[PDB]
Amino acid sequence: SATPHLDAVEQTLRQVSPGLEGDVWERTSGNKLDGSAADPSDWLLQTPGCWGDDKCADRVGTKRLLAKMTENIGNATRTVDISTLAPFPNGAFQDAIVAGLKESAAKGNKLKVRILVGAAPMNVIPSKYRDELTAKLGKAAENITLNVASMTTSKTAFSWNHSKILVVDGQSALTGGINSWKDDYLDTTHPVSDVDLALTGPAAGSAGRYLDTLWTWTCQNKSNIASVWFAASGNAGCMPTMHKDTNPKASPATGNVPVIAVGGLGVGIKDVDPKSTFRPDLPTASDTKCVVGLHDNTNADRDYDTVNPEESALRALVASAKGHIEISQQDLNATCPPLPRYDIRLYDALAAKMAAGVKVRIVVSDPANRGYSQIKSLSEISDTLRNRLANITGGQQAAKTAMCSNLQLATFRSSPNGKWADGHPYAQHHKLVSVDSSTFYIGSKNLYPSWLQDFGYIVESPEAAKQLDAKLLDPQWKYSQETATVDYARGICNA
Numbered sequence: 001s002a003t004p005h006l007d008a009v010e011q012t013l014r015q016v017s018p019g020l021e022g023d024v025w026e027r028t029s030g031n032k033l034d035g036s037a038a039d040p041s042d043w044l045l046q047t048p049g050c051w052g053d054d055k056c057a058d059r060v061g062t063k064r065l066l067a068k069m070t071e072n073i074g075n076a077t078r079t080v081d082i083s084t085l086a087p088f089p090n091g092a093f094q095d096a097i098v099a100g101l102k103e104s105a106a107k108g109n110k111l112k113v114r115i116l117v118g119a120a121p122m123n124v125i126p127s128k129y130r131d132e133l134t135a136k137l138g139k140a141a142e143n144i145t146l147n148v149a150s151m152t153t154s155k156t157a158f159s160w161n162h163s164k165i166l167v168v169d170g171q172s173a174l175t176g177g178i179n180s181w182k183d184d185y186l187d188t189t190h191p192v193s194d195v196d197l198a199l200t201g202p203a204a205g206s207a208g209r210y211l212d213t214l215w216t217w218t219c220q221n222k223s224n225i226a227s228v229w230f231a232a233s234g235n236a237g238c239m240p241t242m243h244k245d246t247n248p249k250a251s252p253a254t255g256n257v258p259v260i261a262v263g264g265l266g267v268g269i270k271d272v273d274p275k276s277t278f279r280p281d282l283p284t285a286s287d288t289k290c291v292v293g294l295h296d297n298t299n300a301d302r303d304y305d306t307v308n309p310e311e312s313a314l315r316a317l318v319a320s321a322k323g324h325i326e327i328s329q330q331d332l333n334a335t336c337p338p339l340p341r342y343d344i345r346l347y348d349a350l351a352a353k354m355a356a357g358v359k360v361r362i363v364v365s366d367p368a369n370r371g372y373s374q375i376k377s378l379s380e381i382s383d384t385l386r387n388r389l390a391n392i393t394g395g396q397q398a399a400k401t402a403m404c405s406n407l408q409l410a411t412f413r414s415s416p417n418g419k420w421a422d423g424h425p426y427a428q429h430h431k432l433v434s435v436d437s438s439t440f441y442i443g444s445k446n447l448y449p450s451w452l453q454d455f456g457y458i459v460e461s462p463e464a465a466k467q468l469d470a471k472l473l474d475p476q477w478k479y480s481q482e483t484a485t486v487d488y489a490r491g492i493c494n495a
Contacts, residue, residue, distance in 0.1 A: 031201030032255025073100025091182025118161030153268030208243030
């Protein structure tokens with residue numbers, strides 16, 4: 001095949017979540033990574049994009065991210081569809097949305113707009129955000145039908161929307177890890193380092209079907225104050241199926257890029273995919289669950305996987321690698337309680353790969369951040385990998401040799417300095433996996449245990465994967481390798 005990695009992932013997802021194909025995951029062809037003529041890798045909406053400068057003076061990433069947001073929204077003719085994690089967008093993110101909506105209005109378009117945030121359980125937040133937006137729009141609000149909502153799907157599982165998506169006309173989609181939070185990303189001399197992608201094509205429709213899934217639940221639960229706080233313009237109702245109702249089911253082709261869209265429904269929306277007959281083997285005994293009483297959805301709940309295909313898709317992406325795997329995350333491990341510390345099957349898949357000589361790079365955020373870190377030491381990652389490798393290499397000594405011959409494990413820096421020039425540690429927030437300079441995931445879904453609604457794209461294009469290397473992964477490794485505890489390429493093995 002032209003696409004051996006997507007082929008593998010697709011076969012898994014069809015076993016795991018068949019009833020969800022089309023809506024919560026979907027393979028499409030004919031997409032385009034939507035970069036400029038001048039700088040074609042700029043589909044890759046990294047932020048801040050100030051490599052090598054501990055002052056972050058020239059934020060070429062941030063500038064491109066905001067311009068692209070405004071451009072896509074300003075090209076809207078029918079719909080704008082936005083999800084994120086609360087707080088609601090502010091500062092220049094908000095400015096970007098308003099500028100775009102004013103542009104669309106000035107071109108003569110009447111739009112439907114949904115803006116959905118996951119929260120944390122008398123909430124005036126949504127009505128307040130609607131009113132602020134309508135005010136800032138002025139006249140341009142007259143032809144916008146607006147829906148604004150905050151939602152929590154499960155209080156006990158800490159489940160709510162964590163996806164960050166911006167779909168226009170079901171044709172263009174921006175998604176990734178970036179929260180629209182000005183103080184963390186923008187008005188700061190220690191900006192969080194993160195990444196979204198920009199695409200067009202049928203895969204933008206997959207995002208639109210994903211958001212209709214979320215809004216169908218939200219609108220159903222709109223009179224439940226515990227679950228949903230909803231606010232709309234004028235007389236307008238909740239729009240559960242804006243995408244279905246307004247955009248073509250058959251989104252126009254824009255390129256030749258194959259993509260798998262994959263999301264998750266968390267906990268509290270739908271408990272199982274009744275069509276699934278997936279029954280995987282439970283992994284070998286681990287020490288992931290810190291307390292006996294905790295219900296562990298990541299490692300001990302078969303029904304959970306079936307409505308959360310993204311967990312399996314990321315494990316399947318790892319399992320598809322023939323040569324090398326690069327992972328860039330905030331964390332690999334979660335704080336326990338109330339989550340288990342780690343995804344056992346993920347670490348098992350990384351271990352299987354290193355046992356077979358496939359190289360693995362893991363960069364996480366500096367533990368000095370601990371919001372943007374959930375470990376105290378990199379040894380919490382290496383110990384776990386070593387322990388899972390021991391199960392398959394015959395013991396602890398062999399495990400450590402395998403690990404040291406195949407792992408790069410470090411914390412993130414973006415310049416020669418150990419911290420930003422302002423004294424604050426570098427924080428990263430990517431949810432990035434790339435394999436074989438071929439196929440990569442950019443989305444909201446963390447690899448650490450998490451039971452939220454999330455979404456992302458897995459893209460198979462060596463062209464694009466090489467741009468990703470040159471523009472993000474190579475510079476990341478250039479500066480971050482100085483913190484490595486394990487680095488096979490340099491004979492470093494301190495774990």
